[PDB]
Amino acid sequence: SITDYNYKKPLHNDYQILDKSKIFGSNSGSFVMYSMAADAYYIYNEKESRKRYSPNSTYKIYLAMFGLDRHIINDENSRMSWNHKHYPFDAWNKEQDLNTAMQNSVNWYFERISDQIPKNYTATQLKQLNYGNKNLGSYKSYWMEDSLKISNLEQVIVFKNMMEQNNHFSKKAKNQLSSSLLIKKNEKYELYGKTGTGIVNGKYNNGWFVGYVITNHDKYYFATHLSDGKPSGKNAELISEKILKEMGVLN
């Protein structure tokens, strides 16, 4: 418990320390990036990057994966009916498929998936995935400012590993997941990712943007965590991109 807020495991890869404090501006947090080609990490604010926070809606990545893996949703049909309950966001108040669910961060879609998953499966997956503190707690919205916590550095390690390694997870699962995460594509690059936002007492307190970039030459996994300032998922995306552009990943 006293070491379950911190990822202490030393890196067995080359790594560089960046200074993107100018881009982060009045916001506080960290940025991590992995380069498939260099098998190397690029970290800004490694202290913050090793502190564990709740994953918020970035966990939807893994919930989506579990749902595909247990045939809750599939490639032929991932649709779910709206229950006719009003939600704060209009995009939630309609039928969803994985793509629309993921793109609009429709909580109830993944909640409905979460309810059909046994706890021992979830716990087995987190173990094998090395997902943060691996702490399910009461097993009720555990990924939402609750027991489960992961570090910015681990977000990149766990995601890259799950996607790139020969897991029990199928290639078509990974591709379907990957489809649901595609944000931008042009001649130069494909950008994939997922935002996370936390709100406490009407104040943003926890902002994620986790994803990856495919170029012609390389492939990159990355994540931005915001802890103070204006720590929203959107602000995490904006910062991620201007860092990726200024580092010449998006050109």
Where in the sequence numbering do the catalytic residues fall? 57
The b/e string for 105-128 (b: 16+ C-beta within 10 A; e otherwise) is bbbbbbebbbeebeeeebeebbee
Our finding on whether 245 is near a second copy (CB under 8 A) is no
* Cα 172 to Cα 167: distance, rounded to the nearest angstrom: 12
Which of 41/225 has CB closer to ligand UJ9? 225
* Cα 55 to Cα 208: distance, rounded to the nearest angstrom: 7
To 5 degrees, how large is the angle CA 49–CA 236–CA 173?
Answer: 85
Could you say which of ligand UJ9, a second copy, none residue 56 binds, taking C-beta under 5 to 8 angstroms by partner kind? ligand UJ9
Could you say which of a second copy, ligand UJ9, none residue 171 binds, taking C-beta under 5 to 8 angstroms by partner kind? a second copy
Q: Which of residues 49-88 bind a second copy (CB under 8 A)?
A: 75-77
* Cα 31 to Cα 44: distance, rounded to the nearest angstrom: 5
Q: Among candidates 250, 184, 195, which has minimal Cα distance to 225?
A: 195
CB 172 → ligand UJ9: shortest distance, Å? 25
Among 25, 179, 234, 246, binds a second copy (CB under 8 A): 179
Among 183, 227, 229, 242, binds a second copy (CB under 8 A): 183
CB 186 → ligand UJ9: shortest distance, Å? 17
Our finding on whether 234 is near a second copy (CB under 8 A) is no
* Cα 62 to Cα 90: distance, rounded to the nearest angstrom: 24
Binding residues vs ligand UJ9 (CB under 6 A): 56-57, 105, 107, 144-145, 195-200, 232-234
Could you say which of a second copy, ligand UJ9, none residue 180 binds, taking C-beta under 5 to 8 angstroms by partner kind? none
Which of 49/96 has CB closer to a second copy? 96
Query: Tokens representing 66?
Result: 């579990």
Could you say which of ligand UJ9, a second copy, none residue 247 binds, taking C-beta under 5 to 8 angstroms by partner kind? none
Q: Residues 237, 209: contact at Cβ < 8 Å?
A: yes
Which of 105/151 has CB closer to ligand UJ9? 105
Q: Residues 29, 18: contact at Cβ < 8 Å?
A: no
Could you say which of a second copy, ligand UJ9, none residue 81 binds, taking C-beta under 5 to 8 angstroms by partner kind? none
The DSSP code sequence of 64-119 is: HHHHHHTTSS-SS---B---S---SSGGGSS-B-HHHHHHTT-HHHHHHHHTTS-H
CB 76 → a second copy: shortest distance, Å? 5
